[PDB]
């Protein structure tokens, strides 16, 4: 029925959208918390009406893309163990088993997340004329949105494990990786500021509903908007802004108020609950979230109301976790970036300790120091022969002949070969380094290698005694060739006839004597 | 044409200044933000005039010193891959090819960083006579300086990579390295305090320009300095300090002001915007920058103006990044400095677990503890043979002849041997350590090494039985010499005739039996 | 290493493609070191499940 193979190219662009749509959907649900307002001139409690249309349109148009995901999840096939086939697992393309696997383990953390519970309580409010139902609408959004965050957060888990398998666990680490924990501060700040706005409006409601049960000429149905044409309201309208300002006023310095507002007094004394511009209202609350999540609650001055205290305790713990997660990743990123340089500094302290313990002369200390500095400038701590030996055999042979073929095609005995033994010597040449004024070989010493000069400039004397010069491309140590070539040699090394000395810094390739007879006995 | 060779000595002293002139030029651009002032006598808005001379002289005398760099960049050759090389790269010295390479990589963002855009709007202001030019001059510096700063920061990237190649990556780790992230706090503080000064003067301007369009007898051209000889100003002059004080006054405790200044009220209530000493003005703003980047905005109390809120969100994020970069680099520095001691502590915790599991007697536990303590005091965790085996062969021979020649020239068979074959036994000697009262060999046991005493004091008995003494310089185990010398031996080890015991702590050099026959069969 | 030796820009792509392919198959796990640390009886039962219907 076009049943899908999990490494199709088509279920890769159709799965990089269902992860980016699950991140857009946890950013839209806080916008339902900005629905209650205060009408300032009329002193009534209302509902913002162009926000409740938009935030219900956007959630419904987003949660239909995730109806496609469960459709492509019945046309999918899974891998099970078997010893019969040899490709590590048999592919089960079989209907009424792939579907019976699915709807018992990940169908309830996927069906319970698209049910439009906030979208219907807006529809019932906008088709009504009873003005005193703005409290039931406002009540049935805190718990609905707060309890429909278990599935809409938990459903990102089975889809990230499928992006953990095709493009790997990898993803970049500059402009990603540590940029991910700064964008988590920004979403936590956005949920916290919208909880703060909504709880401030409920404390303002608790104040108003009790200055009306002491004034005598009020019912609690006159406080909500759209209830001005009722009998008894013309008496209450005469005395609104004397009762509602002698009992329920908000001021940041008044140290003895008739009602304590606690952490919510900053939202009622600035007037963002009656604000008409939505950009001002959004930005003010998001900065409250970021400022109180970064300092871990230090500027908060609560009242003795217990749910306010429990909200404050939650902020100081979430901020402690977020900070530690950011400092954890920035450091593992930085430690991995200077690893080769930190090894060089440990090696130099070890060398200074060893030369101080053995009490070396000061002219040998400087030779050791110069060799270590030259090797750090040439290699940066990278081990090249360990890198090359971990590549496959065909590509290792292609890399060694770009590097060592024009050098070995300058020995005259080697140009008389069949281009098969000429590629078995290129695979045993190994790199070497010599600082200035070092002796590469002394006269009368047993010769142990042949050398091939890449860079630098040397000199050579024989028995002031017809001295010579050597430069790039030339070689050294061909007394070992005549030894290893014929079996008239014995297992003993010849003696040198030259003395070779470096006049600058040299780089070379080397050929060990135990690797030259193994080539020579291919004749 | 003297085409330059990229590792010339001259291009390494003529590139350690073009890095230090780029650090100096990003410290000069904030000084253009201190140009608007307030004249407190006349209550008018002006421009500081010696600061606009001085801060325009210095930028022009630096951008032309940098203008020499790209000319030297027009004379430089580059390296390309080739297989006809002997040196891993062909040098391209064609001037028809180096310039066509240069004008594709780093010419556009090197050219748009020398363009004197702030230097001409000072020149046009200082040649003018109408006093209402202090708003266009002040407006064309925020965006110019803020957008011409992406090239003046990006142009450090190739020059730093060319210092990451000839001088290593190591400069210094204790007198630098962690001193680099404290000097970055000081430059971020310096840019932030100058943004704060400039935005405070624009809020003060927004207040004044609206107490003049409600007083009725003001035009907005009377607020700027140098417009006192206009008709209509003599009416406005009689009522300056009644309108501008009842409408736009600043006070830190006034919780109900006619204008809200927000985070800028500290700069207008202290009077640094009318200050005459420049040291007071500079120091006050730089400490505001450092204090608010260090505590991440905790003390800021904004207004409901939306660009003021975005400015605060930026500070809270930049401070979070700077702090984590500072704790990260101190800890990688400190962890690399105690690496040998933490490894001794881990090794010490493993031995107690092993001896508790096997339930060892308490006299065998103390013998293990004493050897571990003595070895930590002698070596500090440094592996000496791994260090020596990584040096070149000529320098290994010199170090090993300085350490071990006057010991092998006290054996009577060895002193008569040779001079080239003495340098082959002084390459296989390896160091040893013995705590007190340990037995170096027992009578009747197979002899497996020869020993050469460096330090300490021993005793020796044979079959209370004509006991002897040994001290520094003497040796032990020469029954192996007679075994390995002649081929009348068989592949079996002799038996000891002595019992050697340590009376103090000993250090020695050792010679393995499988290394003594390899020397002896060189005869 | 490839910048230092000045490799041609077609051996570089072969090295990059081998490294990317090996990371997706092993995740950095060395399985011959894992298998050699198991007891001898269970090592035999794992190698028979992997390699017996392939050599016959």
UniProtKB/Swiss-Prot annotation, chain C:
Where does this one sit in the cell?
Cell membrane
Known role: Probable cyclic nucleotide-gated ion channel.
How the protein assembles, per its UniProt entry? Homotetramer or heterotetramer.
Domain remarks = The binding of calmodulin to the C-terminus might interfere with cyclic nucleotide binding and thus channel activation.
Q: Which family does it belong to?
A: Belongs to the cyclic nucleotide-gated cation channel (TC 1.A.1.5) family.
Name-wise, this protein is: Probable cyclic nucleotide-gated ion channel 5
- According to its UniProt entry, this protein's organism is Arabidopsis thaliana (Mouse-ear cress)
What gene name is given for the protein in this entry? CNGC5
Covered part of the full sequence, start to end and full length, is: 439 to 494 of 717
């Amino acid at each position: 029925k076009k049943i899908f193979d999990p490494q199709d190219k088509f279920l890769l662009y159709c799965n990089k959208l269902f992860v980016a749509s699950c991140i857009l959907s946890v950013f839209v649900d806080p916008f339902f918390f900005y629905l209650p307002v205060i009408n300032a001139e009329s002193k009534c409690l209302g509902i913002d009406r162009k926000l409740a249309i938009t935030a219900s349109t956007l959630r419904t148009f987003i949660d239909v893309f995730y109806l496609a995901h469960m459709a492509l999840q019945l046309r999918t096939a899974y891998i099970a163990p078997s010893s019969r086939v040899f490709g590590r697992g048999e592919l089960v393309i079989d209907p009424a088993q792939i579907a019976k696997r699915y709807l018992q383990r990940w169908f309830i953390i996927d069906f319970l997340s698209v049910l439009p519970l906030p979208q219907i309580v807006v529809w019932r409010f906008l088709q009504s004329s009873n003005g005193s139902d703005v409290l039931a609408t406002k009540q049935a959004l805190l718990f609905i949105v707060l309890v429909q965050y278990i599935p809409r957060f938990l459903r990102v888990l089975p889809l990230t494990s499928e992006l953990k398998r095709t493009a790997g666990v990898f993803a970049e680490t500059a402009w990603a990786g540590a940029a991910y924990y700064l964008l988590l501060y920004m979403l936590a700040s956005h949920i916290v500021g919208a909880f703060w706005y909504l709880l401030a409006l409920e404390r303002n409601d608790a104040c108003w509903q009790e200055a009306c049960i002491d004034a005598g000429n009020c019912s609690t149905d006159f406080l909500y908007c759209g209830n001005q044409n009722m009998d008894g309201y013309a008496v209450w309208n005469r005395a609104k802004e004397s009762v509602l300002k002698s009992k329920c006023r908000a001021d940041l310095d008044d140290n003895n108020p008739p009602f304590d507002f606690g952490i919510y007094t900053q939202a009622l004394s600035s007037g963002i609950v009656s604000s008409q511009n939505f950009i001002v209202k959004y930005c003010y609350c998001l900065w409250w979230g970021l400022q109180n999540l970064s300092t871990l609650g230090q500027g908060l001055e609560t009242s003795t109301y217990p749910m306010e205290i429990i909200f404050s305790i939650s902020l100081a713990i979430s901020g402690l976790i977020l900070f530690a997660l950011l400092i954890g990743n920035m450091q593992t990123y930085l430690q991995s970036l200077t690893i080769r340089l930190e090894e060089m500094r440990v090696k130099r302290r070890d060398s200074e300790q060893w030369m101080h313990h053995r009490m070396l002369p000061q002219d040998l200390r400087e030779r050791v120091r110069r060799y270590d500095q030259y090797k750090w400038l040439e290699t940066r701590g990278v081990d090249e022969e360990y890198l090359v030996q971990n590549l496959p055999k065909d590509l290792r042979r292609d890399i060694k002949r770009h590097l060592c073929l024009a050098l070995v095609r300058r020995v005259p005995l080697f140009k008389s070969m069949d281009d098969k033994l000429l590629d078995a010597i290129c695979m045993r040449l190994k790199p070497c380094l010599f600082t200035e004024s070092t002796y590469l070989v002394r006269e009368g010493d047993p010769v142990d290698e042949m050398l091939f000069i890449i860079r630098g400039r040397l000199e050579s004397v024989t028995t002031f005694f017809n001295r010579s010069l050597l430069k790039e491309g030339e070689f050294c140590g061909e007394e070992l060739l005549t030894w290893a070539l014929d079996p008239k040699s014995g297992v003993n090394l010849p003696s040198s006839t030259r003395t070779v000395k470096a006049l600058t810094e040299v780089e070379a390739f080397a050929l060990t004597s135990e690797e030259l007879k193994f080539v020579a006995s291919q004749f």
